[PDB]
Design an enzyme around this catalytic site. Structure first.
Site, PDB file in Angstrom:
ATOM      1  N   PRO A  59      -8.534  -7.991  -6.933  1.00 23.16           N
ATOM      2  CA  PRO A  59      -9.500  -6.758  -7.801  1.00 23.16           C
ATOM      3  C   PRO A  59      -9.367  -5.245  -7.123  1.00 23.16           C
ATOM      4  O   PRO A  59      -9.378  -4.453  -8.133  1.00 23.16           O
ATOM      5  CB  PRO A  59     -11.208  -7.170  -7.256  1.00 23.16           C
ATOM      6  CG  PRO A  59     -11.101  -7.781  -6.461  1.00 23.16           C
ATOM      7  CD  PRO A  59      -9.571  -9.317  -6.021  1.00 23.16           C
ATOM      8  N   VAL A  60      -8.816  -4.789  -6.006  1.00 25.87           N
ATOM      9  CA  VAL A  60      -8.927  -3.650  -6.239  1.00 25.87           C
ATOM     10  C   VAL A  60      -7.753  -3.798  -4.996  1.00 25.87           C
ATOM     11  O   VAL A  60      -7.742  -4.390  -4.401  1.00 25.87           O
ATOM     12  CB  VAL A  60      -9.712  -2.928  -5.534  1.00 25.87           C
ATOM     13  CG1 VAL A  60     -11.455  -3.159  -6.411  1.00 25.87           C
ATOM     14  CG2 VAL A  60     -10.899  -3.940  -4.497  1.00 25.87           C
ATOM     15  N   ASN A  61      -7.034  -2.589  -4.985  1.00 26.30           N
ATOM     16  CA  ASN A  61      -5.901  -1.798  -4.480  1.00 26.30           C
ATOM     17  C   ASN A  61      -5.579  -0.446  -4.114  1.00 26.30           C
ATOM     18  O   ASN A  61      -5.724  -0.431  -4.853  1.00 26.30           O
ATOM     19  CB  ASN A  61      -4.741  -2.776  -4.109  1.00 26.30           C
ATOM     20  CG  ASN A  61      -3.215  -2.731  -3.779  1.00 26.30           C
ATOM     21  OD1 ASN A  61      -4.021  -3.621  -2.023  1.00 26.30           O
ATOM     22  ND2 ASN A  61      -2.406  -2.561  -3.730  1.00 26.30           N
TER      23      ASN A  61
ATOM     24  N   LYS B   3     -14.347  -1.349   9.343  1.00 26.92           N
ATOM     25  CA  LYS B   3     -15.390  -2.212   8.215  1.00 26.92           C
ATOM     26  C   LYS B   3     -16.059  -3.328   8.361  1.00 26.92           C
ATOM     27  O   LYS B   3     -17.531  -3.752   8.620  1.00 26.92           O
ATOM     28  CB  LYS B   3     -15.928  -1.326   7.166  1.00 26.92           C
ATOM     29  CG  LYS B   3     -14.685  -2.489   6.520  1.00 26.92           C
ATOM     30  CD  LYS B   3     -14.898  -1.762   4.528  1.00 26.92           C
TER      31      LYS B   3
ATOM     32  N   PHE C 158      -4.846  -1.704   5.371  1.00 29.81           N
ATOM     33  CA  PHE C 158      -5.673  -0.888   4.726  1.00 29.81           C
ATOM     34  C   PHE C 158      -7.000  -0.960   4.373  1.00 29.81           C
ATOM     35  O   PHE C 158      -7.176  -2.173   3.714  1.00 29.81           O
ATOM     36  CB  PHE C 158      -4.733  -0.643   3.603  1.00 29.81           C
ATOM     37  CG  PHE C 158      -5.357   0.796   2.696  1.00 29.81           C
ATOM     38  CD1 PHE C 158      -6.912   1.095   2.210  1.00 29.81           C
ATOM     39  CD2 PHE C 158      -5.157   1.946   2.844  1.00 29.81           C
ATOM     40  CE1 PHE C 158      -6.969   2.427   1.642  1.00 29.81           C
ATOM     41  CE2 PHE C 158      -5.461   3.209   2.524  1.00 29.81           C
ATOM     42  CZ  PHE C 158      -6.472   3.034   1.730  1.00 29.81           C
TER      43      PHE C 158
ATOM     44  N   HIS D 163       0.469  -0.915  -0.361  1.00 34.34           N
ATOM     45  CA  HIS D 163      -0.194   0.173  -0.010  1.00 34.34           C
ATOM     46  C   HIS D 163       0.573   1.328  -0.083  1.00 34.34           C
ATOM     47  O   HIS D 163       0.373   2.429  -0.277  1.00 34.34           O
ATOM     48  CB  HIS D 163      -1.307  -0.271   0.933  1.00 34.34           C
ATOM     49  CG  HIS D 163      -1.731  -1.472   1.094  1.00 34.34           C
ATOM     50  ND1 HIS D 163      -3.008  -1.469   0.654  1.00 34.34           N
ATOM     51  CD2 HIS D 163      -1.779  -2.290   1.952  1.00 34.34           C
ATOM     52  CE1 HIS D 163      -3.580  -2.596   0.821  1.00 34.34           C
ATOM     53  NE2 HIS D 163      -3.161  -2.875   1.485  1.00 34.34           N
TER      54      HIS D 163
ATOM     55  N   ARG E 242      -8.057  -1.028  -9.823  1.00 38.35           N
ATOM     56  CA  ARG E 242      -8.942  -1.820 -10.217  1.00 38.35           C
ATOM     57  C   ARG E 242      -9.566  -2.728 -11.481  1.00 38.35           C
ATOM     58  O   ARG E 242      -8.493  -2.076 -12.594  1.00 38.35           O
ATOM     59  CB  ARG E 242     -10.573  -1.025 -10.350  1.00 38.35           C
ATOM     60  CG  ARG E 242     -10.976  -0.377  -8.452  1.00 38.35           C
ATOM     61  CD  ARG E 242     -11.379   0.600  -8.852  1.00 38.35           C
ATOM     62  NE  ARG E 242     -11.935   1.818  -7.608  1.00 38.35           N
ATOM     63  CZ  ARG E 242     -12.056   2.700  -7.658  1.00 38.35           C
ATOM     64  NH1 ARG E 242     -12.922   3.689  -8.875  1.00 38.35           N
ATOM     65  NH2 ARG E 242     -13.036   3.310  -6.295  1.00 38.35           N
TER      66      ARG E 242
END
EC number: 4.6.1.18
Length: 125
Positions: free
Chosen positions: A43-45, A67, A121, A13, A86
């Site tokens: 898929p996302v970072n 979350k 993250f 990150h 993405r």
């Protein structure tokens, strides 16, 4: 060799070496070189373009819920330069493909240890 959870957060990150994504191929390049895409496409970072000292500082800022409900998350006071990676519609392992987008947002991270530093993250907000 050993990799701590803090060091893993830096690898997955942090990119302090640029003020923002350096090209439209930035996410393709970084998802590969930081070894995020070994066994499946992530898929996302998010990558954060800020000094390590400034990101580590977040662990002494605003305590918030993660979350997933845990309570060792912290939100930054400052607004940080970030890149969101993405997967494209055509991405298919092992040929993972990403779109590079730029933003300026608060970040939320999970923290542990002494020194008290990021190990997770959670989100940008």
């Amino acid at each position: 060799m050993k990799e701590t959870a803090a060091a893993k957060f830096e690898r997955q990150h942090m990119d302090s070496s640029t003020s923002a994504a350096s090209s439209s191929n930035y996410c393709n390049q970084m998802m590969k070189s930081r070894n995020l895409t070994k066994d499946r496409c992530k898929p996302v970072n998010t990558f954060v373009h800020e000094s390590l000292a400034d990101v580590q500082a977040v662990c002494s800022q605003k305590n918030v819920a993660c979350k997933n409900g845990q309570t060792n998350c912290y939100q930054s006071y400052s607004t940080m330069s970030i890149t969101d990676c993405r997967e494209t519609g055509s991405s298919k392992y092992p040929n993972c493909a990403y779109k590079t987008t730029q933003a300026n947002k608060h970040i939320i991270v999970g923290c542990e240890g002494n020194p008290y530093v990021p190990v997770h993250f959670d989100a940008s907000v």
